[PDB]
From a paper:
From the 67-residue construct, PfRON2-5, that we previously showed to have affinity for PfAMA1, and guided by the TgAMA1-TgRON2sp structure, we synthesized two analogous PfRON2 peptides: PfRON2sp1 (residues 2021–2059; numbering from the initiation methionine in PF14_0495), and PfRON2sp2 (residues 2027–2055). PfRON2sp1 and PfRON2sp2 were co-crystallized with the first two ectoplasmic domains (DI, DII) of recombinant PfAMA1 3D7 or CAMP strains, respectively. PfRON2sp1, traced from Thr2023 to Leu2058, includes a disulfide bridge between Cys2037 and Cys2049 and makes several direct contacts with PfAMA1, resulting in a total buried surface area of 3154 Å2 (1441 Å2 for PfAMA1 and 1713 Å2 for PfRON2sp1). Overall, the binding paradigm established by TgAMA1-TgRON2sp is maintained, with an N-terminal helix seated at one end of the AMA1 receptor-binding groove and extended through an ordered coil to a disulfide-closed β-hairpin loop, generating a U-shaped conformation. Similarly, exposing a functional receptor-binding groove on AMA1 requires displacement of the extended non-polymorphic DII loop, which adopts a disordered state (not modeled between Lys351 to Ala387); this region is stabilized by DI in apo PfAMA1. Intriguingly, the backbone of the N-terminal helix and additional coil of PfRON2sp1 (2024-QQAKDIGAG-2032) overlays remarkably well with a section of the apo PfAMA1 DII loop (360-YEKIKEGFK-368) (rmsd<0.4 Å), which also includes a helical region. The majority of intermolecular contacts are formed by the segment Lys2027-Met2042 of PfRON2sp1. An influential residue on PfRON2 appears to be Arg2041, a residue specific to the P. falciparum species, located at the tip of the β-hairpin with its guanidyl group fitting snugly into a preformed pocket of PfAMA1. An additional feature of the PfRON2sp cystine loop region is the presence of a cis peptide bond between Ser2043 and Pro2044; the Ser-Pro-Pro segment contributes negligible buried surface area but is important for maintaining the β-hairpin conformation for efficient complex formation. Since PfRON2sp1 is more biologically relevant than its truncated counterpart, it is used for the following analyses unless otherwise noted.
Residue numbers in the entry:
A (entry chain A): 108 to 350, 388 to 441
B (entry chain B): 2023 to 2058
Amino acid sequence: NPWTEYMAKYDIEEVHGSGIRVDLGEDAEVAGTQYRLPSGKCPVFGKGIIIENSNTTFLTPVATGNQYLKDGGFAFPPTEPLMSPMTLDEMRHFYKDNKYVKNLDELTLCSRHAGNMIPDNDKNSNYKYPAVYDDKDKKCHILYIAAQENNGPRYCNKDESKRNSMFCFRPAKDISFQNYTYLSKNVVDNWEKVCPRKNLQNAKFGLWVDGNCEDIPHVNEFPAIDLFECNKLVFELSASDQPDRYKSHGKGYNWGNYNTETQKCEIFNVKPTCLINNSSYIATTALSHPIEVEAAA
Amino acid sequence: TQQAKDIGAGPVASCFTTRMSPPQQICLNSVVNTAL
């Protein structure tokens, strides 16, 4: 298989190793309770969180002090000195003296910055907050809330007049989330080499068998008007750690072959191991950015 | 609270220390909403 190293980034179970839609792949002990934590090793491009029946954007700080719960989002509340949000520039300055961190790309720097805060009860230093990097404003947002999905009248309430009740929410990709990248504490600093990012133009994921690249023999077809919508669908169906019985370890419907002419998002759940040259196809994954395309060149 | 943990509810925290030296203390201006 001459495809082996090229295709290595597509073995999501190995290079990511956690949920994608919902990433709660590790447990962190804090005063004797095991809290669930994001732990995927790849950046999830375009993922954000939608709070249901709400105008509150999830990068809004969590409610503190005298605010209502439903008035805050998921992000770190103001601190002294102010840790979040922090611009790329601020981070480079703040971490200027640190040998390992000072020169990291923006996503890994944002992950290491979020993972720098030890909660005061965490005697063993286990707990590392996830983060969202917004590359339009170039700001790292540490997420105080690590949860990514909460539905059902049982655990959330959509009633906008009950403003100290727990809100419902879900992970999503959305055109408005295009500039967001969701980062676990485990984001690897060489993600650029070992993780999906770009959608592959003129290529169809296949399986290498006995010297030849075969079509994926069974796929789940969803209509989709464009690549963006295909990437969204794959994301919705991808590895999820949402209720180690609840851990996906990165197993799920993480790949799609998008046929631009038939507008079919062909979604499948095994690692592909080669590419087929087909001008009708764009190869996407739940991790990949929902817009960016790598030229056939 | 069991099911809250299971969906990723986290510990409450008031101040933080940094992992990267020099160790620095950092505190929330106010307490996070009780209902978390």
